[PDB]
Design an enzyme around this catalytic site. Structure first.
Site, PDB file in Angstrom:
ATOM      1  N   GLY A   1       0.916  -1.068   0.000  1.00 49.53           N
ATOM      2  CA  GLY A   1       0.000   0.000   0.000  1.00 49.53           C
ATOM      3  C   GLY A   1       0.998   1.163   0.000  1.00 49.53           C
ATOM      4  N   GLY A   2       0.593   2.218   0.689  1.00 45.80           N
ATOM      5  CA  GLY A   2       1.286   3.475   0.860  1.00 45.80           C
ATOM      6  C   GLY A   2       2.703   3.392   1.238  1.00 45.80           C
TER       7      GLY A   2
ATOM      8  N   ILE B   1       6.903  -7.801  -1.184  1.00 44.05           N
ATOM      9  CA  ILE B   1       5.942  -8.860  -1.138  1.00 44.05           C
ATOM     10  C   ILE B   1       4.612  -8.283  -0.795  1.00 44.05           C
ATOM     11  CG2 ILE B   1       5.541 -11.129  -0.098  1.00 44.05           C
ATOM     12  CD1 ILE B   1       8.917  -9.491   0.325  1.00 44.05           C
TER      13      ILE B   1
ATOM     14  N   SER C   1      -4.344  -2.326  -2.314  1.00 41.86           N
ATOM     15  CA  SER C   1      -4.090  -2.070  -0.886  1.00 41.86           C
ATOM     16  C   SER C   1      -5.137  -1.033  -0.289  1.00 41.86           C
ATOM     17  CB  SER C   1      -2.640  -1.453  -0.805  1.00 41.86           C
ATOM     18  OG  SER C   1      -1.503  -2.249  -1.172  1.00 41.86           O
TER      19      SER C   1
ATOM     20  N   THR D   1      -4.928   1.622   1.080  1.00 36.84           N
ATOM     21  CA  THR D   1      -4.637   3.010   1.068  1.00 36.84           C
ATOM     22  C   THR D   1      -5.422   3.713  -0.034  1.00 36.84           C
ATOM     23  OG1 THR D   1      -2.444   2.759   2.202  1.00 36.84           O
ATOM     24  CG2 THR D   1      -2.866   4.759   1.249  1.00 36.84           C
TER      25      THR D   1
ATOM     26  N   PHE E   1      -9.122  19.837   8.358  1.00 38.00           N
ATOM     27  CA  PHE E   1      -9.295  18.441   8.748  1.00 38.00           C
ATOM     28  C   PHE E   1      -8.789  18.046  10.088  1.00 38.00           C
ATOM     29  CE2 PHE E   1     -10.752  14.620   6.601  1.00 38.00           C
ATOM     30  CZ  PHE E   1     -11.324  15.147   5.520  1.00 38.00           C
TER      31      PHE E   1
ATOM     32  N   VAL F   1       2.520 -13.859   3.153  1.00 36.04           N
ATOM     33  CA  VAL F   1       3.748 -14.042   4.010  1.00 36.04           C
ATOM     34  C   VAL F   1       3.414 -14.699   5.309  1.00 36.04           C
ATOM     35  CG1 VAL F   1       5.353 -12.762   5.323  1.00 36.04           C
ATOM     36  CG2 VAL F   1       5.267 -12.227   3.046  1.00 36.04           C
TER      37      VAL F   1
ATOM     38  N   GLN G   1      -9.433   3.787  17.059  1.00 37.42           N
ATOM     39  CA  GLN G   1     -10.214   4.987  16.725  1.00 37.42           C
ATOM     40  C   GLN G   1     -11.409   4.760  15.769  1.00 37.42           C
ATOM     41  OE1 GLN G   1      -8.722   8.725  14.003  1.00 37.42           O
ATOM     42  NE2 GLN G   1      -8.955   8.843  16.260  1.00 37.42           N
TER      43      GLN G   1
ATOM     44  N   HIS H   1     -14.992   6.145  13.636  1.00 36.68           N
ATOM     45  CA  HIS H   1     -15.222   7.296  12.749  1.00 36.68           C
ATOM     46  C   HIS H   1     -16.653   7.619  12.994  1.00 36.68           C
ATOM     47  CE1 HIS H   1     -14.699   9.861   9.206  1.00 36.68           C
ATOM     48  NE2 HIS H   1     -16.008   9.734   9.259  1.00 36.68           N
TER      49      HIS H   1
ATOM     50  N   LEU I   1     -17.230   4.183   4.913  1.00 40.12           N
ATOM     51  CA  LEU I   1     -17.034   5.542   5.314  1.00 40.12           C
ATOM     52  C   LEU I   1     -17.797   6.608   4.534  1.00 40.12           C
ATOM     53  CD1 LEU I   1     -14.769   6.976   7.230  1.00 40.12           C
ATOM     54  CD2 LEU I   1     -13.940   7.891   5.079  1.00 40.12           C
TER      55      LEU I   1
ATOM     56  N   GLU J   1     -15.501  13.014   6.572  1.00 41.51           N
ATOM     57  CA  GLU J   1     -15.805  14.260   7.351  1.00 41.51           C
ATOM     58  C   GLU J   1     -16.116  15.363   6.361  1.00 41.51           C
ATOM     59  OE1 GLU J   1     -13.190  13.956  11.340  1.00 41.51           O
ATOM     60  OE2 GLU J   1     -12.706  15.735  10.139  1.00 41.51           O
TER      61      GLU J   1
ATOM     62  N   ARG K   1     -13.792  15.152  17.656  1.00 43.03           N
ATOM     63  CA  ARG K   1     -14.093  13.745  17.327  1.00 43.03           C
ATOM     64  C   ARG K   1     -14.983  12.929  18.278  1.00 43.03           C
ATOM     65  NH1 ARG K   1     -12.591  11.167  14.142  1.00 43.03           N
ATOM     66  NH2 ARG K   1     -11.195   9.498  13.425  1.00 43.03           N
TER      67      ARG K   1
ATOM     68  N   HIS L   1     -12.477   2.277  12.877  1.00 45.88           N
ATOM     69  CA  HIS L   1     -11.671   2.852  11.803  1.00 45.88           C
ATOM     70  C   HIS L   1     -10.174   2.733  11.764  1.00 45.88           C
ATOM     71  CE1 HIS L   1     -11.761   5.881   8.545  1.00 45.88           C
ATOM     72  NE2 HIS L   1     -10.699   6.423   9.090  1.00 45.88           N
TER      73      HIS L   1
ATOM     74  N   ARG M   1      -5.401   9.598  16.671  1.00 47.59           N
ATOM     75  CA  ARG M   1      -4.840  10.008  15.390  1.00 47.59           C
ATOM     76  C   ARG M   1      -5.559  11.206  15.081  1.00 47.59           C
ATOM     77  NH1 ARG M   1      -6.193   9.934  10.377  1.00 47.59           N
ATOM     78  NH2 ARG M   1      -7.805   8.340  10.713  1.00 47.59           N
TER      79      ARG M   1
ATOM     80  N   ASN N   1      -3.364  12.934   9.243  1.00 42.67           N
ATOM     81  CA  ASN N   1      -1.977  12.666   9.577  1.00 42.67           C
ATOM     82  C   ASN N   1      -1.587  11.281   9.165  1.00 42.67           C
ATOM     83  OD1 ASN N   1      -0.796  14.834  10.744  1.00 42.67           O
ATOM     84  ND2 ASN N   1      -1.104  14.212  12.810  1.00 42.67           N
TER      85      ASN N   1
END
Ligand SMILES: Cc1cc2nc3c(=O)[nH]c(=O)nc-3n(C[C@H](O)[C@H](O)[C@H](O)COP(=O)(O)OP(=O)(O)OC[C@H]3O[C@@H](n4cnc5c(N)ncnc54)[C@H](O)[C@@H]3O)c2cc1C
Ligand SMILES: CC(C)=CCC/C(C)=C/CC/C(C)=C/CC/C(C)=C/CC/C(C)=C/CC/C(C)=C/CC/C(C)=C/CC1=C(C)C(=O)c2ccccc2C1=O
Ligand code: SF4
Ligand code: F3S
Ligand code: FES
Lengths: 577, 130, 119, 243
Positions: A14-15, A36, A44, A46, A117, A158, A231, A233, A243, A246, A288, A356, A391, A395
């Site tokens: 992913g990211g 991998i 992914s 992300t 945000f 893996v 966390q 949402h 989702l 926001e 939040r 989340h 979080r 971020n």
């Protein structure tokens, strides 16, 4: 066991571990990097991110502003030196992404726009439409192509990493398609397997998010830290838990009860606001957990609206009228009418709060290195300690990109010193990766994994969610304890050898079955309340920095138990206030 | 060996016959047959209107034949279909930008049509009136 | 796998023609079918404005010479290109197709260009 | 209430065992929110643990769950049982080779997605320097061509591909076009050579069915035409090129 040598080995694409590939790939041109992943990199999670990546950019902004925001946000539980560094690299790293040509959305002058945000004052969220995480991942995944130094091991689930004499030496994996195991030898491993949320009944996490990485980590005596801050949402479609970003609240969304009274005006979120003036820090863009807490508050009041989907509140948008939407709010619309039957102009989208993000993770120092020399973790599967107890919106992608390159480097480097370990032991340890997996396949016993899966997830949801109470966490440990026993009794039907997901699924359920146990004790022990972990039992309902300012460390042991240790939180220019 | 046996499907000639969108696709394309034959009629026309008036009258005779006349209307139908379909696709290869959004087909389609409308007349006034 | 270096097809020629083809056969062809195909022999045309005498006038005169070329030709290229392909699209093996059609498409451009230059 | 029952037909195919795919029938409980992915789940979960197939995001964003539903390409992801009361036949996404059940080998797809260099080429500037500038306007040029999620459905709708497997396919060209059309790129030469070949844009008869099935409204087929108009401009310059 077919083997392969490699300079470094990245679990997940992913990211983060994607950005880690890239990095290592240029710290050193002649390196042989193996990426991998169990799915083509581009699917992914992300991809599903919408809001954006945080990155200090406005002229009136400032790194102190973004630093102090982040600490208080998390309630001081962040390690400040790590935060410091994080804030100061986000702007380079988002630029670089814009250099690799990711489509950030812009200002009429051709420069980069920002959005509000995560409850900060000075905005700093960079975004590519409503589709930010997709543009990132897709933008990293093509960028990586221009480097032969990275050889992808795609659809390769893996199993276990290799370890000896305090050091990492490799990993083992199954070619999913082929049904066989190679064993990849490298002397650094970045673990960037991403998220733990699917161990909950309701949540936003895609199917792949099952804790793989964090699991392997436990089994090697490595701890999971801050593992009990989960966390949630505020706005989850019922049932799927999909989702609703926001963003829509920030563009004029309403949240209301059966009487559509705009109810977060009395949980200390009010001075109501005009339909037009939505205001930061207040009513619907209020704090939040506050919003999530008011759901429960308004749930406990007989005030939420009952569907077969479950109780709900309503966020109203019907009062924006097209053009407002489609410019800045399009997918959400398609989402609504698809997954619940609600066209964002003629009725209201039912939304309940939903699970989340995993603030928790694999212990890491400031460079992403674990207590096991050569082993790194980066991304949501890890705990560098930026987030502490909660979080901040935007971020998280910022993290991937920022610490995934530092993980990329440091890894590289470590890999250029390891000296060789005992080429006999290791082999014999991958050796046991095979034997072990096998003792799973023949299990005779008959449990549908599937029930265990529905049963855990539900357990998690009930006794470890927004509002937490002793009696209940205790249930959740006891449940888990039981699931755990019972997994040793589930037999696996498909003895087939090609893309046999019957098996892979089970392996992954076993892992979360360990992350889980590992967030419930963490919690039941945190007799205090912070950021996302809030108990009501008498005595532990306030934040306590006298005796609760530390990171929780959970360790699965060999005899199967979960054991805690508390390490201290590193401070620099912002003492608990 | 592998334990995989990657099964590959047959792609028949009945392919286009299955989906009602492929059916229609093939159609637009048959649109060419008649469109050529008419180009052949036109040629005969050109060579008869040269072998001398005796002949050009026998060309017209062929055009009087009922058969030839069903066939020729059908030619007109093809054409009209092609003209419709074609106009909706050309646009899709122009990538223009107005105000600050990227524009759509709705507008070109409109003029490609106006131009047809006008020519159709400015031509019928020429061969029929003047 | 995906051949590093590939041969630059030459198709942007028949296609290019075909473009012109389709666009002309699309503005101007329906109206002329109407005249030559129906109106002319159904006698439904005022006085003597469509009779040997008059037609030949136009035909014989330049801008009516350039005109019948294009009206014959482009619709040929266009449609020929389409039935070329339309062949494969139907899995029919035509020996040497490229030459046949665009071959035929040239021969007939010649025949026509002839008729038009003679009278 | 009391919940409805649909009867799904999913095409099973094993390499290890069967010699050709074959049908199968499952009966699935369902309500007005039930998706194909959702049912696929219910099946493996309690009547057929052996079914395997691809899925992740659950919200038509990731691009794994594509397949065929009654001959049409779709995302299990986003297909509801409510629209298929008179019957439902689910095969593996057409025009690709079945490996197992509803999973098919998608390597050509990737190999192509790769081949056309889908990355910014030749743009010197570096971070310390700042981002490049690009106007809401420039962006617009390639914008839509950037929403592709590598789902592979256009590849299962274009016969031109199912008649000629060497064809790099809609998505591939699109993706490429996107980088080609992006004001900050400098690798157009780097990318044309594929595009101008026979299995490049000139393998397209403009059926249009790909743009018709795209779950993210990209309109691949508008991208390919543009390709053509560009290939063709390239062929001319090179006919004035021999130098
Ligand atoms: C719906 C949704 C919306 C979000 N929106 C935002 C936002 O707007 N802004 C923001 O900052 N954050 C957002 N987030 C959170 C943030 O995007 C994630 O926390 C972050 O993307 C984590 O991704 P990752 O790079 O660490 O790795 P992941 O993206 O989760 O990828 C992990 C990779 O590892 C692979 N893998 C896993 N286990 C194994 C194994 N055992 N063997 C081999 N491979 C394995 C897989 C996958 O390829 C959102 C999350 C969700 C679910
Ligand atoms: C700028 C603008 C608008 C114009 C510039 C001038 C040009 C190129 C004008 C077009 C000429 C024009 C208006 C033509 C109308 C058509 C006519 C008179 C068609 C006549 C005609 C008929 C009716 C036949 O039956 C027939 C049969 C076999 C061979 C040829 C013919 C033929 O030419
Ligand atoms: S162009 Fe559309 S249909 Fe094709 S792969 Fe991309 S998202 Fe899927
Ligand atoms: S359907 Fe196929 S023929 Fe071209 S227009 Fe799309 S790639
Ligand atoms: S599972 Fe992600 S596209 Fe449907």
């Amino acid at each position: 066991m077919q083997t392969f040598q490699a300079d470094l080995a990245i679990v997940g694409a992913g990211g983060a571990g994607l950005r880690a590939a890239i990095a290592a790939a240029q710290a050193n041109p002649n390196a042989k990097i193996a990426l991998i992943s169990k799915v083509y990199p581009m699917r992914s999670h992300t991809v599903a991110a919408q809001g954006g990546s945080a990155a200090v950019a406005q002229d009136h902004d400032s790194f102190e502003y973004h630093f102090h925001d982040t600490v208080a946000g998390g309630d001081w539980l962040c390690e400040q030196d790590v935060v410091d560094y994080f804030v100061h690299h986000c702007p380079t790293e988002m630029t670089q992404l814009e250099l690799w040509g990711c489509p950030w959305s812009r200002r009429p002058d051709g420069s980069v726009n920002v959005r509000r945000f995560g409850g900060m004052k000075i905005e700093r969220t960079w975004f590519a439409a409503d589709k930010t995480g997709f543009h990132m991942l897709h933008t990293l995944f093509q960028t990586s192509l221009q480097f032969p130094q990275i050889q992808r091991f795609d659809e390769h689930f893996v199993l276990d990493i290799l370890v000896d004499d305090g050091h990492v030496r490799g990993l083992v994996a199954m070619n999913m398609m082929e049904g066989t195991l190679v064993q990849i030898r490298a002397n650094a491993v970045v673990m960037a397997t991403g998220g733990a949320g699917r161990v909950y009944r309701y949540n936003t996490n895609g199917g792949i998010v099952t804790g793989d990485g964090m699991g392997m980590a436990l089994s090697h005596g490595v701890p999971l830290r801050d593992m009990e801050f989960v966390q949630y949402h505020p706005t989850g479609l019922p049932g799927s838990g999909i989702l609703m970003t926001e963003g829509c609240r920030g563009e004029g969304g309403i949240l209301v009860n059966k009487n559509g009274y705009r109810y977060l005006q009395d949980y200390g979120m009010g001075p109501e606001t005009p339909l037009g003036e939505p205001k930061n820090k207040y009513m619907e863009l209020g704090p939040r957990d506050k919003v999530s807490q008011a759901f429960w508050h308004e749930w406990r009041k007989g005030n939420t609206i009952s569907t077969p989907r479950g109780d709900v509140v309503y966020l109203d948008l019907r009062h924006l009228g097209e053009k407002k939407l489609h410019e800045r709010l399009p997918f959400i619309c398609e989402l609504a009418k698809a997954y619940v039957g609600v066209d964002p102009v003629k009725e209201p989208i039912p939304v309940r709060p939903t699970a989340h993000y995993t603030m928790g993770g694999i212990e890491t120092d400031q460079n992403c290195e674990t207590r096991i020399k050569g082993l790194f973790a980066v991304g949501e599967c890890s705990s560098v300690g930026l987030h502490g107890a909660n979080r901040l919106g935007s971020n998280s992608l910022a993290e991937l990109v920022v610490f995934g390159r530092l993980a990329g480097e440091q890894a590289t480097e470590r890999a250029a010193t390891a000296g060789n370990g005992n080429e006999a032991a290791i082999e014999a340890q991958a050796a046991g990766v095979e034997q072990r997996l096998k003792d799973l396949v023949n299990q005779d016993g008959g449990e549908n994994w599937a029930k265990i899966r529905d049963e855990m997830g539900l357990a998690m949801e009930e006794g470890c969610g927004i509002y937490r109470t002793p009696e209940l966490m205790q249930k959740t440990i006891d449940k888990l304890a039981e699931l755990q026993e019972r997994f040793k009794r589930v037999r696996i039907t498909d003895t087939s050898s090609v893309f046999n997901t019957d098996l892979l699924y089970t392996i992954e359920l076993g892992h979360g079955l360990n992350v889980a146990e590992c967030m419930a004790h963490s919690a039941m022990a945190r007799k205090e309340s912070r950021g996302a972990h809030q108990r009501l039992d008498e005595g532990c309902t306030e934040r306590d920095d006298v005796n609760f300012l530390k990171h929780t460390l959970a360790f699965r042991d060999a005899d199967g138990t979960t054991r805690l240790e508390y390490s201290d939180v590193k401070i620099t220019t912002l003492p608990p206030a | 060996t592998t334990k995989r046996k990657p099964y590959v499907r047959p792609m028949t000639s009945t392919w286009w016959k299955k989906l009602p969108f492929y059916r229609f696709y093939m159609l637009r394309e048959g649109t060419a047959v008649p469109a050529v034959w008419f180009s052949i009629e036109l040629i005969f026309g050109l060579f008869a209107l040269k072998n001398g008036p005796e002949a050009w009258a026998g060309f017209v005779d062929f055009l009087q034949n009922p058969v030839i006349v069903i066939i020729n209307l059908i030619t007109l139908a093809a054409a009209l279909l092609h003209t419709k379909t074609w106009f909706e696709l050309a646009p899709k290869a122009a990538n223009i930008i107005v105000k600050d959004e990227k524009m759509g087909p709705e507008p070109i389609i409109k003029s490609l049509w106006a131009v047809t409308v006008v020519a159709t007349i400015v031509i019928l006034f020429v061969a029929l009136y003047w | 796998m995906i051949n590093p270096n590939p041969k630059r097809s030459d198709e942007p020629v028949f296609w290019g023609l075909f473009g012109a083809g389709g666009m002309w056969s699309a503005i101007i062809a329906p109206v002329m079918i109407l005249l030559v195909g129906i109106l002319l022999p159904l006698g439904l045309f005022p006085g003597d404005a469509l009779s040997y005498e008059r037609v030949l006038a136009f035909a014989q005169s330049f801008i009516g010479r350039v005109f019948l070329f294009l009206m014959i030709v482009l619709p040929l290229w266009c449609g020929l290109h389409r039935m070329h392909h339309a062949m494969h699209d139907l899995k029919i093996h035509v020996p040497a197709g490229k030459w046949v059609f665009y071959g035929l498409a040239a021969i007939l451009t010649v025949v026509t260009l002839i008729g038009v230059v003679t009278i | 209430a009391e919940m409805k029952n649909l009867k799904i037909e999913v095409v099973r195919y094993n390499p290890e065992v069967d010699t050709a795919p074959h049908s199968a029938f499952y009966e699935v409980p369902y309500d007005a929110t039930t998706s194909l992915l959702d049912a696929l789940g219910y099946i493996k979960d309690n009547l057929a643990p052996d079914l395997s197939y691809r899925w992740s995001c659950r919200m038509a964003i990731c691009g794994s769950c594509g397949m065929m539903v009654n001959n049409v390409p779709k995302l299990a992801c986003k297909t509801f049982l409510r629209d298929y009361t008179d019957g439902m036949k689910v095969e593996a996404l057409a025009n690709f080779p079945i490996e197992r059940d509803l999973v098919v080998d998608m390597t050509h797809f990737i190999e192509s997605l790769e081949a056309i260099k889908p990355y910014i080429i030749g743009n010197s500037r570096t971070a310390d320097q700042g981002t490049n500038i690009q106007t809401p306007a420039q962006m617009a040029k390639y914008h839509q061509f950037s929403g592709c999620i590598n789902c592979g459905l256009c590849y299962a709708a274009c016969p031109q591909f199912g008649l000629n497997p060497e064809f790099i396919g809609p998505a591939a060209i699109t993706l490429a076009h996107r980088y080609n059309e992006d004001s900050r790129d400098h690798g157009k030469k780097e990318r044309m050579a594929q595009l101008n070949s026979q299995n490049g844009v000139w393998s397209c008869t403009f059926v249009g069915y790909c743009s018709e099935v795209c779950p993210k409204h990209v309109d691949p087929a508008a991208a390919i035409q543009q390709g053509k108009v560009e290939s063709s401009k390239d062929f001319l310059i090179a006919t004035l090129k021999p130098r």
